[PDB]
Design a protein around this nucleic acid. Sequence first.
DNA 1: ATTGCAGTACCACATTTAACCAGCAG
DNA 2: TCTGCTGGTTAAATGTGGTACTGCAA
Length: 168
Amino acid sequence: KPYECYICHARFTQSGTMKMHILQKHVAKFHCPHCDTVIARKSDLGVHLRKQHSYIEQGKKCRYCDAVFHERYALIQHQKSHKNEKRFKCDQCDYASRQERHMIMHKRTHTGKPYACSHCDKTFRQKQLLDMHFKRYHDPVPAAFVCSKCGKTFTRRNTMARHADNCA
DNA sequence: ATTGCAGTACCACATTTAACCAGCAG
DNA sequence: TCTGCTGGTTAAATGTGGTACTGCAA
Ligand SMILES: [Zn+2]
Ligand SMILES: [Zn+2]
Ligand SMILES: [Zn+2]
Ligand SMILES: [Zn+2]
Ligand SMILES: [Zn+2]
Ligand SMILES: [Zn+2]
């Protein structure tokens, strides 16, 4: 199918689309009257505001918040007020978590320890991350953390680092 | 010197979603 | 030709999560 584009030899089925390629490469508007976005093609602006800016009859709720919105753009934009913010406040105590998983663990301290070692009568509140009890006690290598140059060893980086600050 | 615990930092992997783009009917 | 739609394709942001790390207080 013709017709080849002269500067760059597309490759287009119909002339109108080819001239569209000359316009795109080979720029253009358009700016959504309501939001600050810009769209390549006008028809794509059409879809943008048939999807972001149509009145939704039953409002949607924020994932983190109690705000409802009847506009999609308004809804997402709001969820912005929640990004990189502590979005999971805790009812019993004033601790807040950016991620829910953490909120669940914190809860456990208030609502008491369902992780249990197979080999021992030990229950760990947090997730497996405390089944590293398993590595230490049911014992397949603690980390060295060597200082320089005194060559001393520490079981923890931070302590070693502090020591390294003033050593000879 | 240390460790366990609660909670954070870091960094990688999986998901979503909104514009792109070609082609099309009217 | 011209205009407005589409469905499927493409990446950037964000959710998800593993884990090493930390600060605190035994
Ligand atoms: Zn060209
Ligand atoms: Zn808009
Ligand atoms: Zn909200
Ligand atoms: Zn709490
Ligand atoms: Zn055990
Ligand atoms: Zn040293």
